Amino acid sequence: QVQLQESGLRLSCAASGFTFSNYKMNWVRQAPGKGLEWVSDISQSGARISYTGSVKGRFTISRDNAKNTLYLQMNSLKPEDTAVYYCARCPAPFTRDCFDVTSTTYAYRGQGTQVTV
Amino acid sequence: KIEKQLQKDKQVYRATHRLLLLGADNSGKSTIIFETKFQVDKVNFHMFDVGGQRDERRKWIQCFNDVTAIIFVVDSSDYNRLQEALNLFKSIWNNRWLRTISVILFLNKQDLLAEKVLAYFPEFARYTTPDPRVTRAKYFIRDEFLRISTASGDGRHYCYPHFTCAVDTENARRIFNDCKDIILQMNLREYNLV
Amino acid sequence: TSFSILMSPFVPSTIFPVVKWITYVGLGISIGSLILCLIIEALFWQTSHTRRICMVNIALSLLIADVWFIVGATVGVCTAAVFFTHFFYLSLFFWMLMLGILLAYRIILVFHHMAQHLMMAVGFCLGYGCPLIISVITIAVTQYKRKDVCWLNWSNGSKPLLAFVVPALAIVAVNFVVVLLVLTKLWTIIRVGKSLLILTPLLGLTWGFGIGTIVDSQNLAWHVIFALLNAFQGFFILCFGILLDSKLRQL
Amino acid sequence: RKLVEQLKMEANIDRIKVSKAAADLMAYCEAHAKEDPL
Amino acid sequence: GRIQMRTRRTLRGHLAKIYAMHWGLLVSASQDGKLIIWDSYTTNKVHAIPLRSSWVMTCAYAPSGNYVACGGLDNICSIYNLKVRVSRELAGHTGYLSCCRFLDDNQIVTSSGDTTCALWDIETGQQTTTFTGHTGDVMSLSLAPDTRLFVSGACDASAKLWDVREGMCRQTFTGHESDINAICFFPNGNAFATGSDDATCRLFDLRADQELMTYSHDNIICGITSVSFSKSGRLLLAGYDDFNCNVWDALKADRAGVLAGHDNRVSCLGVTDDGMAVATGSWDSFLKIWN
Ligand SMILES: CCCCCCCCCCCCCC(=O)OC[C@@H](O)COP(=O)(O)OCC[N+](C)(C)C
């Protein structure tokens, strides 16, 4: 039963039912009234990190594999950042591609945080 | 004598060089499952525009690996979608099955981009061009795609960028030339010359 | 027992041992190397199929050619050895031409795929039957060999060595043309060197140096470099094709 | 609401302990092992 | 012990890669378009049916053996008669067809990418029932031996056990971590093993509703594309990616051999109904038959 929780600024994500280290992780925001957007990614080792262009260098993503948790550190939030933030998983282990991270009806993401400044 | 018919089947199959079409909904896919067979220079291409399937593409993209080349049409005026398009390109470049096949990139709606720029990415500030503003934006988007194109897996396959308006009719010649170049590169690869 | 006799009758004896020993060692190690080439290429296995059959056929032709040249030179059995050497060298040269023309047609006429059966039929025909025709017609015409050398002569056999030289020079010329075309379509300073390095032994452009052996036969430098290159061609094939192939080196 | 009905209907199912399941699977496999060409 | 199966036969008539197959003769579906009904013992191509749609994804052989179904990204399940023109074109889906099987000579169940499994009928081409629930799109199903139940594997970490007559689900098993793309029932009809993208065949039990065994080995990190039990079910032939197939001891969860010899990915790993030999597809356009 792959189930991902959600809490939370410092957004927190707890994953259970699978090995956290193998799968790449993403933060993707559904803005209110339009399609999804991808916010940032972090790989297994944490060496490769990338963020959308809008939030380049403003946010900060980090994962604790020992605790099996993921964290996004949002600093200096703008009112355009209000959205529902989801903690999506790459759909396969040991791969450099996540095909359907932003799909409307994706299966390996579950969360809700109506962030409003 | 089923083998006799299968020989002609082999001739027909090898005669037709397949393709694939991929892009966003708003991107000008039509101007460039739907099958549209067309012939240029006495060689027949049989492309495909898959539209009936759901948005999850980790399931049926894997069975488009024998394609000669994937056409990737990208909106180049909708900035909000552009990043998403780039991510799609990443998932096509890094796949364990589509690693061999090249990609022919079209940056649609150049006239719309010119109109918009004449009237998201912070790297644009520290960027220089490889009237000035529009060409700067065009080549910036092209380089943004080519950076990920040449980041990894350069030897196995290479990307061919192209700028296409919404009114031009030279797309067939462009794809014909790109397919010829791709087939030449495979033939050289099998000979170990490259 | 020099190797420069294969393109001229002169072969001056100013330096016997160097040219006679470089030829022998090159031939011996080139038969050994080609045996190794057949061994490794066995069980390894369209463009790939056509290239592979061309490679095994040209390797076999070279193997038999130097073997028969050795047994002819060391020793009317050698009268038949002359025929066998002529036929097999011409078969190898026509396989070389076939590989060159196939490469040219595959680089120039993409989208034009010919039938496989017709492809191998044309290749086997042009690689074997025409050398057989040349051997039978020339031996019928002149019956031949040299007075004290078991190879076709010049004075009584000018037509034999002309019939060995003209197709050899024509084949080397067309191979040079298609190699130049391939380099043009491939030219990137190390890739061009890699392509020339892998293509020159397999297409045998080195035999073009035999030009000098029939023009400037007085000089011995051309004789020795000719003997060296065309005696070590087998070693060159086994080395330059395989180590350069990173895929097969790993495999 | 459909998911709630789904879990509600799926939960009320009688089940046998895993030991009995493994035991009967082993018995079936042993009985039918004589006709396994592989 | 250790199983040393070797290539009994090799069928090499296809123009391009094959996507599926099914035993009775032996049908096989290609990418070029041909749907060839191979002969297993003599290797003669008994039939070479061209297809309107080149993109195939599956193929079926009805137990009566008179019909053959096939469908792909065209969304249309074309059913052909073999007694050789198309008999019907079942068309009600909104996604690519991934697997279709025949209950009898009158109806067929299809598993599309529309996150639904349809229960078609051949007489009029109407969905008698439409099983739905799986959030992700189905990739493979397998009818029970009694044919009164059939299980389906979604692209979510889930599988379901729909009942054909009732038209409603019965159980759900979500012990996996990634997509499911292969299922085959235990021959008795009380358990089933599901290969997955995470490279772990797991065996669920219907009576207990739990994963009895997990065929996980740390060495192998490549996903599964097909599974199949033998006649007695002791063996579990799982067709991995990375150009190989592995046979597991179904009860001991211990390795027992390897089948290798493919130059490209495996895409279907069925076995004979009588269990006298096994087949294997390939993306190299080379069907093989081991024994
Ligand atoms: C592996 C063995 C089979 C390989 C087949 C390679 C040949 C493919 C078919 C080409 C047929 C060309 C005619 C022929 O058999 O060769 C005659 C040659 O001596 C010269 O012919 P050309 O007129 O130069 O033919 C080549 C013309 N190109 C350069 C325009 C292709």
Author numbering:
A (entry chain N): 1 to 8, 18 to 126
B (entry chain A): 25 to 56, 207 to 253, 264 to 303, 311 to 321, 331 to 394
C (entry chain R): 567 to 611, 618 to 647, 655 to 722, 727 to 770, 785 to 848
D (entry chain G): 13 to 50
E (entry chain B): 41 to 64, 69 to 127, 133 to 340
Which sentences from the paper describe this structure?
Intramolecular ligation of this tethered agonist (TA) to the 7TM domain relays the initial extracellular cue to the cell through G protein coupling or beta-arrestin activity.
To elucidate the basis for selective recruitment of Gαs/q, we complexed ADGRF1 CTF with a miniGαs/q heterotrimeric G protein complex and the Nb35 nanobody, purified the complex by size-exclusion chromatography, and determined its structure by cryo-EM to 3.4 Å resolution. MiniGαs/q was engineered as a chimera with six key Gαq residues on the C-terminal α5 helix that distinguish Gαq coupling over Gαs, even though the bulk of the chimera is derived from miniGαs27. At the ADGRF1 G protein interface we observe a canonical pose of the C-terminal α5 helix at the open cavity at the intracellular opening of TA activated ADGRF1. Three hydrogen bond interactions appear to stabilise the ADGRF1-Gαs/q interface in our structure. The N387 amide side chain nitrogen of miniGαs/q approaches within hydrogen bonding distance of the backbone carbonyl of ADGRF1 R6853.57, E390 carboxylate approaches within hydrogen bonding distance of the hydroxyl group of S6202.43 and the amide side chain nitrogen of N392 approaches within hydrogen bonding distance of D8428.47 side chain carboxyl group. This inward movement leads to a rearrangement of the TM I alpha helix, allowing the conserved S5961.50 hydroxyl to approach within hydrogen bond distance of the backbone carbonyl of A8287.48 at the kink in the TM VII helix.
